[PDB]
Design a protein around this nucleic acid. Sequence first.
RNA 1: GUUACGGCGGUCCAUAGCGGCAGGGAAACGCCCGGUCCCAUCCCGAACCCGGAAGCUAAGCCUGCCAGCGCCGAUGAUACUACCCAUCCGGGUGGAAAAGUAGGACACCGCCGAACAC
Length: 182
Amino acid sequence: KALPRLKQRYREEIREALQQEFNYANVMQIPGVVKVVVNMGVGDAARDAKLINGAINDLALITGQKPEVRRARKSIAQFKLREGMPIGARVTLRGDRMWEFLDRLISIALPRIRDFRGLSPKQFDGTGNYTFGLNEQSMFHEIDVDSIDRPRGMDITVVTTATNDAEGRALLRALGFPFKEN
RNA sequence: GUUACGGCGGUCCAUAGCGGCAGGGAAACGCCCGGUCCCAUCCCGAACCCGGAAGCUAAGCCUGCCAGCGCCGAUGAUACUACCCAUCCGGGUGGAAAAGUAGGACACCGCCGAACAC
Ligand SMILES: [Mg+2]
Ligand SMILES: [Mg+2]
Ligand SMILES: [Mg+2]
Ligand SMILES: [Mg+2]
Ligand SMILES: [Mg+2]
Ligand SMILES: [Mg+2]
Ligand SMILES: [Mg+2]
Ligand SMILES: [Mg+2]
Ligand SMILES: [Mg+2]
Ligand SMILES: [Mg+2]
Ligand SMILES: [Mg+2]
């Protein structure tokens, strides 16, 4: 008896706009958002693993669901890194959690970005895939500024079912993230 | 019996694989919707699983065509070798490669089950 507003927008106007504007053979060739992954790797756990717990707490307040601790598959003596330490965090947003998190991002963080000039179009890899990395991590309203001790990382990732770059452009612009103009 | 239909299997498992080009939703096969209850995430209904058919053959799958790449492969020749003669030098009988070549080539078959007909 509940349905997110962005999902509603997608199922009412976005899909029909895409369908009419590229003239697909069928209807479900509409691209769709697939998965939302949120994570970051501190890298200094090789010296101190205490801040991993702080990163876990930060992720917990950001997504609301418990993160992960994963190791390194290779050993780098130059980085004083061997297999077995936990290196970063991991969590994934899926379904209603995708839609709520995308809402929260687009409506709270992007307007607030310090010195926001938009995002370029040229960071796709030819099939509409996009993961990337941000100036400051305390940006969401769900986290408080008084309790932070050091700048760490955090994640906002959107991906598509898109076959190539054309519908990637189309659907990302229909959804409306601050794309630059060149 | 027919079908552009799904399962279980075969063969000294690529003549059967990869890629490109077209077509399919009657039932089925898929994608799909949402997590009250079984069940689970080293997080997440992603996977498994729970409940249904609003929607769709585009992927998957199948069928058909392409020699683009892979694959199989002669007859004949060459290398090798078992045995024996010939004062070193060499020859006679038997077996016959590998590579390459003309070409072949976009699998075949068995048992049940789905729609139509008898
Ligand atoms: Mg893609
Ligand atoms: Mg039907
Ligand atoms: Mg689901
Ligand atoms: Mg198709
Ligand atoms: Mg397909
Ligand atoms: Mg070969
Ligand atoms: Mg072949
Ligand atoms: Mg011969
Ligand atoms: Mg003798
Ligand atoms: Mg002699
Ligand atoms: Mg031969």
